[PDB]
């Protein structure tokens, strides 16, 4: 794969990791929709809005299976660890208007 999951359920935004790189999901959109991050940095999107919202992307972006995220509740966050350069495309699952890309190198 090209990123690990250091939780696979949500966290509170206020338990977000020192230097991690962090998206804010905000006036229905990734605040952030291109963000450019080195390997072993980790990302933290944070959803600031009472509608859930994830990221997911596709099989075959970040490793074999589809990375369907966890639905963020208001003011939960989750992230996600890249290993590998190359470029990463998601969108909310429930909202698939809203797009996004971390951007590995
Ligand atoms: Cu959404």
Redesign the pocket.
């Known amino acids: 794969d090209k990123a690990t999951i250091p939780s696979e359920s949500p966290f509170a935004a206020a338990e977000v990791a020192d230097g991690a790189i962090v998206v804010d999901?905000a006036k229905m959109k990734y605040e952030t929709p291109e963000l450019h991050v080195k390997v072993g940095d980790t990302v933290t999107w944070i959803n600031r809005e009472a509608?859930?919202?994830?990221v997911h992307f596709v099989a075959g972006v970040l490793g074999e299976a589809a990375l369907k995220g966890p639905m963020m509740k208001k003011e939960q966050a989750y992230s996600l660890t890249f290993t590998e350069a190359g470029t990463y495309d998601y969108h909310?699952?429930?909202?698939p208007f809203?797009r996004g890309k971390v951007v590995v190198e």
């Open positions: 999901i509608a859930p919202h994830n909310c699952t429930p909202h809203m």
